[PDB]
């Protein structure tokens, strides 16, 4: 029935403004208030405010006050939340949900996809892939991989042997570097006897920068 549609992740420049949208697929946006919850990737859910359809009244928390504006296109019933004067702290995922203030539910039942908003403080950069040599032993669990470094912003996708190599592949979560760029390391466990015979190639693709690098790791 009622499902909420949100746009995709949007990286923004410090000091700009983003207007995350919320569409009612099957809903009418004319009875139950639509609450907006802000969540950093690892955070506790944090209610920002609510917009109520019957009376065109918007309620916003004092902490979020002054920047949040609850606009809404009445035609097609699409509500928009615009967080103005963006700052680094603002980086979080923003969810729109149908609040059942009236009625027995007394909770937010239908949630939205969630539009991730990040404040860049950095320019897009292609990834620099560096090989992780699998030591030098002919045996046995041998570890090799690729170091994707200095790329902005996510996502980057790393595969091994063009998707053939799956087991043992451990792509590690991206870590924001002190410079402001992202970096990840992907490792794979292989038999050390195959080090010389087998050809191991990591396929890294940074679609934001449209950089597809096929680095090879066979020391």
Partner 1 sequence: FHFEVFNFVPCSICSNNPTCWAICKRI
Partner 2 sequence: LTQPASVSGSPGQSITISCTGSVGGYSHVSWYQQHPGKVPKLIISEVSNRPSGISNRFSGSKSANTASLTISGLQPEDEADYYCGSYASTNILHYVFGTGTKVTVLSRTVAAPSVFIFPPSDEQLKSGTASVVCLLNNFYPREAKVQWKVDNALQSGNSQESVTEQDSKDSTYSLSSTLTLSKADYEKHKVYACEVTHQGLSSPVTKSFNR
Give the residues lining the site for partner 2 (CB under 8 A).
35, 37, 43-47, 49-50, 59-61, 95, 99, 101, 104-109, 111-114, 128, 130-133, 135, 141, 143, 145, 147, 149, 170-175, 177, 183-185, 187, 189
d(CA 178, CA 1): 45
Question: Among residues 82 and 154, whose Cβ is nearest to partner 1?
Answer: 82
- Options 16, 85, 88, 102; binder of partner 1; rule CB under 8 A: 102
- Residue 91: closest CA among 27, 137, 153: 153
Joined tokens for residue 10: 């949007």
β-pairing, 108-111 vs 115-119, is unpaired
Shortest distance, position 68 Cβ to partner 1, whole Å: 9
Strand partners, 184: 148
Question: Among residues 17 and 138, whose Cβ is nearest to partner 2?
Answer: 138
d(CA 42, CA 14): 21
Shortest distance, position 43 Cβ to partner 1, whole Å: 24
| Residues of span 46-65 touching partner 1 by CB under 8 A | 51-52, 54-60, 65
Shortest distance, position 25 Cβ to partner 1, whole Å: 20
56 binds, among partner 1, partner 2, none (CB under 5 to 8 A by kind): partner 1
């Amino acid at each position: 029935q009622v499902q909420l549609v949100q746009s995709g992740a949007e990286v923004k420049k410090p000091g700009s403004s983003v207007k995350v949208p919320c569409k009612a697929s099957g809903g009418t946006f004319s009875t139950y208030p639509i609450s907006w919850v802000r969540q950093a990737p690892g955070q506790g859910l944090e209610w920002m405010g609510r917009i109520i359809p019957d009376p065109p009244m918007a309620n916003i928390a004092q902490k979020f006050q002054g920047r949040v504006s609850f606009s809404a296109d009445k035609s097609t019933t699409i509500v928009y939340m615009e967080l103005s004067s963006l700052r680094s702290e603002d980086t979080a995922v923003y969810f729109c949900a149908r609040e059942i203030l009236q009625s027995p539910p007394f909770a937010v039942d239908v949630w939205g996809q969630g539009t991730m908003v990040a404040v860049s403080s950095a320019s897009t950069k292609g990834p620099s892939v560096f090989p992780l040599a699998p030591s030098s032993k002919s045996t046995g669990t041998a570890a090799l991989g690729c170091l994707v470094k200095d790329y902005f912003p996510e996502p980057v996708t790393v595969s091994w042997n063009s998707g053939a190599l799956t087991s043992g592949v451990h792509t590690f979560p991206a870590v924001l570097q002190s410079s402001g760029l992202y970096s990840l390391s992907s490792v794979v466990t292989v038999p050390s006897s195959s080090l010389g015979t087998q050809t191991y190639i990591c396929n890294v693709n940074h679609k934001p920068s449209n950089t597809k690098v096929d680095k090879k790791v066979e020391p």
